[PDB]
């Protein structure tokens, strides 16, 4: 269950 709020940047 991945967190959609995790870091989306490089």
């Amino acid at each position: 269950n991945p967190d959609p709020n995790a870091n989306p940047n490089v």
Partner: antibody, heavy 123, light 108 residues
Framework: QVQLVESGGGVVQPGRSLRLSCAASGFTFNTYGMHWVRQAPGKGLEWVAIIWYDGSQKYYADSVQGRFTISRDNHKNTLYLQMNSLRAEDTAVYFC????????????????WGQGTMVTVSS | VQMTQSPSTLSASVGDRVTLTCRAS??????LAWYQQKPGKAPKLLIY???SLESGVPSRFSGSGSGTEFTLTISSLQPDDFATYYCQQYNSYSFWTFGQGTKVEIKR
């Protein structure tokens, strides 16, 4: 300078499709997570979709799951929103939005917004 | 997570200290941001992580709070600070949700 410029908005019939585009310039666009956020007439801000910097994950608001797809071109520095099965409730200004860069495991606030492009859905 | 702002409108004058309130329906730690938006324009980030002043934002803006109770303060209202202010959470597993805004209007 550092900007986001949206285009593609217009008046469209319900059931039809429309593609929004957002041209980024002035920063290393292919290292940022990017969002679409929308604002219906007279209303507040509502999150629409997120795409990771490398396209590897995407998430969508309940109301657009199965209808909208977010994508990006990391060579042209462009963000897209393909909007299908449009309905009157989708009428809104759509903003492309950059997430503030962060180090570590967590995403951040929205530090850069485009001017917005208006989608009106009506028969 | 639902974000609730109060008051929905306030009336103020240039030079006034103004303080806006934002409440979260459940704890969001410090993953809270404030934005300013004027009619026909896009929002501008003011405060992130509940109390960090965004780069380039005037120093009259400050933010405070954690958990469920947050405030934004403008130490001294400037003539261009009349606008709507939104708070927004980006807590883990909570997506992104905004308060409904507080409009700061001109008193007369």
């Amino acid at each position: 300078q550092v900007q986001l410029v949206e285009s593609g908005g217009g008046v469209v019939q319900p059931g039809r499709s429309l593609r929004l585009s957002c041209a980024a310039s002035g920063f290393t666009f292919n290292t940022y997570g990017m969002h679409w956020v929308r604002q219906a007439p007279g209303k507040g801000l509502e999150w629409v979709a997120i795409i990771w910097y490398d396209g590897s994950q995407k998430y969508y608001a309940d109301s657009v799951q199965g209808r909208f797809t977010i994508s990006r071109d990391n060579h042209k520095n462009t963000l897209y929103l393909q909007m299908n099965s449009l309905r009157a409730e989708d009428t809104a200004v759509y903003f492309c939005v950059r997430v503030r860069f962060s180090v570590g495991p967590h995403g951040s606030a929205f530090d850069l917004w485009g001017q917005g492009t208006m989608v009106t859905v009506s028969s | 997570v639902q974000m609730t702002q109060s008051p929905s409108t306030l009336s103020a004058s240039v030079g006034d200290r103004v303080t806006l309130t934002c409440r979260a329906s459940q704890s969001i730690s410090s993953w809270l941001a404030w934005y300013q938006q004027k009619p026909g324009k896009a929002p501008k980030l003011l405060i992130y992580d509940a109390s960090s002043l965004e780069s380039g934002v005037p120093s009259r803006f400050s933010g405070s709070g954690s958990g469920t109770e947050f405030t934004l303060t403008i130490s001294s209202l400037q003539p261009d600070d009349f606008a709507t202010y939104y708070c927004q959470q980006y807590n883990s597993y909570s997506f992104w949700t905004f308060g409904q805004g507080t409009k700061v209007e001109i008193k007369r």
